[PDB]
Design an enzyme around this catalytic site. Structure first.
Site, mmCIF file in Angstrom:
data_model
loop_
_atom_site.group_PDB
_atom_site.id
_atom_site.type_symbol
_atom_site.label_atom_id
_atom_site.label_comp_id
_atom_site.label_asym_id
_atom_site.label_seq_id
_atom_site.Cartn_x
_atom_site.Cartn_y
_atom_site.Cartn_z
ATOM 1 N N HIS A 41 -9.099 -31.957 -37.862
ATOM 2 C CA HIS A 41 -8.418 -33.139 -37.345
ATOM 3 C C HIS A 41 -9.410 -34.291 -37.018
ATOM 4 C CE1 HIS A 41 -9.172 -32.807 -32.903
ATOM 5 N NE2 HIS A 41 -9.117 -31.500 -33.060
ATOM 6 N N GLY A 143 -13.600 -35.376 -26.780
ATOM 7 C CA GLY A 143 -14.852 -35.320 -27.501
ATOM 8 C C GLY A 143 -15.441 -33.927 -27.622
ATOM 9 N N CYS A 145 -14.086 -31.211 -28.772
ATOM 10 C CA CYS A 145 -13.652 -30.487 -29.946
ATOM 11 C C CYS A 145 -14.867 -30.160 -30.827
ATOM 12 C CB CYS A 145 -12.587 -31.317 -30.696
ATOM 13 S SG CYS A 145 -11.038 -31.903 -29.743
#
Lengths: 306, 306
Positions: A41, A143, A145
């Site tokens: 993503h 952030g 991820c």
């Protein structure tokens, strides 16, 4: 001599974090050999996250529309592609700080360390469990991820988790390292359900053994009981049933301490039916399930490390 | 988004551990520049630990009677000497993995990370507080002497602790890095007293702010109160008095959340006089004092790190 929730040393992993960016979105990536791993993503805006068509979104970028960065140094692109919910970029340098490592898909109730990262830089490390509902109760701001989880193995880093989602209920969700979500979830901003998180019974028991070994030992009593008898109650308090594979792996602690698994169950049985809320074990005023039997055995012995 | 007890990444420190040995005794040492730091009782047997004459014991060894070891590689000796309760060896290599670093003498109530090591190898890392009685409740088995504590600073490792002693009461004791014990203790196998450990009040408060920020927010109430009024009660429950320097550093959380320090005290005042043992905050069934205000501010914000 004490008992702490502790994480594995994060040296081997810090040198593998990088920042991935795709015109706007920046998250963290795992740079091993000549391959960067990161959540897929990263090719989405915040609007796009309502319903991403990952097919159609990926078919538009390209080996330059992606900004990888390890330390000083940008890196250069060579190949891109999507392995379930991860992207696997190709790039022009094998990573020298790459360690001996595996990927594996751990199971509910096993523990691991998380290296929380922001814009490719390490923030901290903590030791968490994978809930039986295949979530973790982590600590992640935007952030983060692409931060990875790793248990260890033994001198060889076993990457087990990549962070993808905070659920609208507060809990955290992610994949293994070849992109397969743990649990039902999808990478899509939606109110999706985990439902019932149970307490990990084998872990609570190993922790009770850790307590005895240090000598917070008040909670013990000479009731006896059967599996059957204990598992009946555990289902009343949403504790996981405990089968024969669990009794076995507790055997080592059974032996070092002089206390049969089924006798320890009896004192836990009773901690459950009441909660003798007078006291404390290892300090905690609640029953702990984020230590496995292997963890207790390491935090006690098998790790006076070499 | 959650709140975990987390430690700093331990990469910068792992590359500084070595093993020191002096014909028999092996413990851990800190290898920076061309200097190894380690506890001075590495020149003692177990018998000798009853009453060591460190003067007379050191005057007998020599720059070869000491076995330093970093990775493959033995190192060679060049100079030895004793700085309070640490020895500072000289050796024939500046350590390349030496980082930017300071030594400082932290104060009670400040927090830091411990890298537990065995025979010079890292075992794990955890985040602990220095008790107001200048002990820590650590996790250490034999051989772990010389494991270091480090808070951070900001890209620059601030070494604050070296482990020396487990007390016969279970708690742990050590020095700063130029050899000065924290608290009264001496490096000598004796039943020595710490006495009264108090709860760190400013840390409990910062943790209550962390709870509100995530939204375990049930415990709040609109009583008001004075410093004076609150500090009276805190002394009843062995909580540290809270002075004006504490109110100040809580100001940042005071501002982000909308809740005056003195109002938060009032809800804590009452958690104390009862203990509304119904519930939980951030899970914990007890009040937490191992997060400082700086820690909460990092675990919330100032560490979306670069």
């Amino acid at each position: 001599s004490g008992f702490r929730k502790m994480a594995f040393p994060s040296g081997k992993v810090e040198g593998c974090m990088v920042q991935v960016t795709c015109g706007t979105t920046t998250l963290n990536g795992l740079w091993l050999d000549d391959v960067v791993y990161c959540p897929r993503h990263v090719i989405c805006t915040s609007e796009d996250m309502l319903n991403p068509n990952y097919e159609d979104l990926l078919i538009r970028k390209s080996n330059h529309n992606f900004l990888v960065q390890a330390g000083n140094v940008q890196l250069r692109v060579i190949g891109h592609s999507m392995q379930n919910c991860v992207l696997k970029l190709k790039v022009d340098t094998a990573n020298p700080k790459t360690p001996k490592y595996k990927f594996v898909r751990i199971q509910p109730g096993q523990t691991f360390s998380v290296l929380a990262c922001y814009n490719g830089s390490p923030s901290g490390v903590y030791q968490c469990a994978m809930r039986p509902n295949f979530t973790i109760k982590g600590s992640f701001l935007n952030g983060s991820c692409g931060s990875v989880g790793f248990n260890i193995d033994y001198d060889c880093v076993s990457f087990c988790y990549m962070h993808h989602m905070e659920l609208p209920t507060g809990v955290h969700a992610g994949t293994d390292l070849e992109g397969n979500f743990y649990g039902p979830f999808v990478d899509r901003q939606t109110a999706q359900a985990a439902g019932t998180d149970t307490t990990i019974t084998v872990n609570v028991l190993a922790w009770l053994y850790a307590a005895v070994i240090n000598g917070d030992r008040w909670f013990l009593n000479r009731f006896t009981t059967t599996l059957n008898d204990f598992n009946l109650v555990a289902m009343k308090y949403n504790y996981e049933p405990l089968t024969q594979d669990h009794v076995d792996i507790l055997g080592p602690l059974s032996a070092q301490t002089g206390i049969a698994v089924l006798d320890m169950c009896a004192s836990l049985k009773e901690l459950l039916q009441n909660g003798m809320n007078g006291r404390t074990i290892l300090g905690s005023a609640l029953l702990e399930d984020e230590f496995t039997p292997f963890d207790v055995v390491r935090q006690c012995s098998g790790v006076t490390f070499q």
